[PDB]
């Protein structure tokens, strides 16, 4: 009797006895979950059996970081976001700068709407990349998917990828049958992924059956990479050496649309809706689930008192020093793919202009931008 006979058991206990102790937690979920909201949601379940305890588990197990906030919850299927919207909506509002339950998201994967980006100064921009994720409708997300679902996804993904030609022809590598020699090459290229080490991922149950049905695919030119069944059904990355962000984004769009077209011919669709855009496992990657970035050398303003305020105004974020930073868009939901990449292209050349002032010895006052 395939039945959530336990959720019914848990219901034999008063809500307060099952309520998690979140006293020292620093994540979006703990900030929103009240004993009242919990009692209201603990009886619900999505069509696939996903519950509120499943949504919040990773947030209960991981207190988080004293200064860095993490989301603390995951979706297990497309319906999760609707069935538990009373928990997800306020979290989405806080995590995505006021994005409200009534706002709409616009998708735009037309590379011709991107203004410049084909000439970022290579003397400062070492590399460029664009990555995103996708979920196939009808299948549960990684925290919840069964072995059958995972394998169906891999078969579907592999036959579509094997159909790509020309600039996008490549090969697939199943994790379980990968050789040491192949693994070495993948590591040297920075294309490899292994069983997650992050307890945030582990605590959600997404690592079950490792490495069954997990795989890596990339084209012969090594400019297009796809991960299958790791954190999301699909993770797609487009990159190359240099500052030609436009070519990277065009390949990204071209590769995405072809894969989507092949899936549609077989009657499969990516999880998507007008309000949250593309649906993925972690609420922080909703909308476009896109991260467009560059490895840029900014030794001078990297030490400036204003760098922090400039990034904020341009809507960029950093991470990685030796003067080399990883700069990418900070937004995910509420802007289209084109707009996000556009903000990285315009924001980067301004960033370069400010670095060239400091090289000379001139101040960077007249170059400060207005909050975008």
Swiss-Prot record:
Any one of the GO BP annotations: response to heat
Top EC class of this enzyme: transferase
Enzyme nomenclature, EC number: 2.7.3.2
Gene3D superfamilies found in the cross-reference section: ATP:guanido phosphotransferase, N-terminal domain (1.10.135.10), Glutamine synthetase/guanido kinase, catalytic domain (3.30.590.10)
Positions of modified residues (Phosphothreonine): 179, 312
Transmembrane among keywords: no
Compartment(s): Cytoplasm
Keyword line: ATP-binding, Cytoplasm, Kinase, Nucleotide-binding, Phosphoprotein, Transferase
Positions of post-translational Phosphoserine modification: 163, 177, 198
Domain Phosphagen kinase N-terminal: 10-97
Residues of the Phosphagen kinase C-terminal domain: 124-350
Major subcellular site: cytoplasm
Its job: Reversibly catalyzes the transfer of phosphate between ATP and various phosphogens (e.g. creatine phosphate). Creatine kinase isoenzymes play a central role in energy transduction in tissues with large, fluctuating energy demands, such as skeletal muscle, heart, brain and spermatozoa.
Protein name as it appears in the record: Creatine kinase M-type
Organism: Bos taurus
GN (gene name): CKM
């Amino acid at each position: 009797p395939f039945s959530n006979s336990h959720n019914t058991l848990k219901l034999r206990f008063p809500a307060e006895d099952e309520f998690p102790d979140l006293s020292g937690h620093n994540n979006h979920m703990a900030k929103v979950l009240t004993p009242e909201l919990y009692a209201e949601l603990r009886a619900k379940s999505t069509p696939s059996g996903f519950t509120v305890d499943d949504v919040i588990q990773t947030g209960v197990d991981n207190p988080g970081h004293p200064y860095i906030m993490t989301v603390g919850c995951v979706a297990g299927d497309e319906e999760s976001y609707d069935v538990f919207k009373e928990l997800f909506d306020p979290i989405i509002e806080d995590r995505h700068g006021g994005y409200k339950p009534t706002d709409e998201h616009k998708t735009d994967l037309n590379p011709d709407n991107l203004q410049g980006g084909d000439d970022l100064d290579p003397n400062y921009v070492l590399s460029s990349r664009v990555r995103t994720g996708r979920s196939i409708r009808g299948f549960c997300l990684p925290p919840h998917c069964s072995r059958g679902e995972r394998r169906a996804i891999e078969k579907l993904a592999v036959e579509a990828l094997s159909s790509l030609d020309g600039d996008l022809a490549g090969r697939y590598y199943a994790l379980k049958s990968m050789t040491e020699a192949e693994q070495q090459q993948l590591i040297d290229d920075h294309f490899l992924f292994d069983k997650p080490v992050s307890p945030l991922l582990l605590a959600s149950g997404m690592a079950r059956d490792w490495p069954d049905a997990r795989g890596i695919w990339h084209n012969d030119n090594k400019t297009f990479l796809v991960w299958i069944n790791e954190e999301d059904h699909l993770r797609v990355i487009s990159m190359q050496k240099g500052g030609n962000m436009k070519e990277v984004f065009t390949r990204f769009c071209n590769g995405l649309t072809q894969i989507e077209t092949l899936f549609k011919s077989k009657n499969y669709e990516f999880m998507w809706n007008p309000h949250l855009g593309y649906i993925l496992t972690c609420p922080s990657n909703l909308g476009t689930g896109l991260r467009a970035g560059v490895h840029i050398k900014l030794p001078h303003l990297g030490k400036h008192e204003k760098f922090s305020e400039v990034l904020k105004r341009l809507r960029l974020q950093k991470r990685g020093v030796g003067g080399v930073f990883d700069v990418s868009n900070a937004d995910r939901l509420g802007f289209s793919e084109v707009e996000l990449v556009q903000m990285v292209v315009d924001g980067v050349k301004l960033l370069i202009e400010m670095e060239q002032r400091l090289e000379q010895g001139q101040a960077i006052d007249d170059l400060m931008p207005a909050q975008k």
